[PDB]
Structure 1
Amino acid sequence: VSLKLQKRLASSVLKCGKGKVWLDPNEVNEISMANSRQNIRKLVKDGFIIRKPQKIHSRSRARRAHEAKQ
């Protein structure tokens, strides 16, 4: 079942990207059943739609490089 309308309206609610929206695949039924920004937000507080954590870009190697340049 299509959840394009819930990847959108979830990026718009969480204020993040479609690639960071995460819809818990075990209960796609209720996600589909909620067809509004209000009903997306109750799902956000209910824990079925979360922001995936931002992918890590560590500058530990940049710090150690500059520390080996001083």
Structure 2
Amino acid sequence: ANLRLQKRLAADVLKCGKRRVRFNPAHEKYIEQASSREAIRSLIESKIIAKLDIKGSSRGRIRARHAAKRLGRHSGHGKRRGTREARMPSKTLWIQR
């Protein structure tokens, strides 16, 4: 009933945080009977224990706004917060020329 030991042992083998380790709701009686990395390794084999993939952040909208910005969109005076020098330093342009 208390399965904090197996959760820490499982995240150790899978090399993941304890938040991304999932146990099959049934077959739980078995997880309770494990106390070693060896017994847990067999459970990750039978598939009773598994690790969820990380959930990154979709960049589809970001890639779209960048495409529009390379076309001249979202870049007028209402969208600029920093000054012209902070956005394009005068010395950088002089050195290039």
TM-score, structure 2 as length reference: 0.69
- The answer to whether structure 1 residue 23 and structure 2 residue 62 are counterparts is no
Alignment match, 2:42: 42
Greater RCO, 1 or 2 (C-alpha within 8 Å, sep 6+): 1
Runs of 4+ in 1 over 4 A off after TM superposition: none
Does residue 51 (structure 1) correspond to residue 58 (structure 2)? The answer is: no
Give 5+ residue unaligned stretches, structure 1: none
1:53 Cα deviation after fit: 2.1
User: RMSD across aligned C-alpha pairs, in angstroms?
Assistant: 0.9
Q: What percent of counterpart residues are identical? A: 44
Bigger radius of gyration among the two: 2
> Normalising to structure 1: TM-score of the pair?
0.93
1:67 maps to 2:67: yes
Q: Deviations over 1:3-47 (max 9, x none)?
A: 100110111010111000001111110011011001111110110
* Aligned AA (1:45): E
